[PDB]
Amino acid sequence: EAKVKEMNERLEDEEEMNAELTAKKRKLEDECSELKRDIDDLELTL
Amino acid sequence: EAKVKEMNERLEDEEEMNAELTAKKRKLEDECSELKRDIDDLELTLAK
């Protein structure tokens, strides 16, 4: 059960690092989106 | 013994998921840097 415990626990550390990386990933997909827009709008006069 | 091994595996997987999703993230960080410079330098030749 001790061996059971520190693994459950460490999973929680890890899973939250991973939770962060996907939330950080979201906003960056979104930011890329709008940056790619700013270009493709602007190039429609060149 | 089972829940022990099962949690071992998941740990190795989460440790690597950390590495994987960060390589995905990074590719977007890189892109979001570059796209910004391409927005900017285009205008930096366009401006008066």
Side-chain angles (χ1 to χ4, degrees), chain A residues 4 7-8 10-11 14-15 17-18 21-22 25 28-29 31-32 35-36 38-39 42 46, chain B residues 3-4 7-8 10-11 14-15 17-18 21-22 24-25 28-29 31-32 35-36 39 42:
Chain A
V4 161
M7 285 194 263
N8 306 288
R10 274 192 294 114
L11 278 174
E14 287 301 321
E15 289 168 31
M17 294 177 70
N18 285 293
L21 298 174
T22 300
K25 191 182 180 295
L28 288 162
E29 298 193 79
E31 195 177 91
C32 275
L35 303 173
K36 282 177 170 64
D38 303 298
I39 303 172
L42 187 60
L46 302 172
Chain B
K3 198 194 171 214
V4 161
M7 287 184 292
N8 279 236
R10 291 160 75 160
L11 281 160
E14 295 304 325
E15 296 181 59
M17 283 185 245
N18 269 297
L21 296 168
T22 304
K24 283 166 162 170
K25 186 188 80 84
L28 297 162
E29 299 181 326
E31 217 215 322
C32 279
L35 297 172
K36 285 187 178 108
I39 297 166
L42 193 59

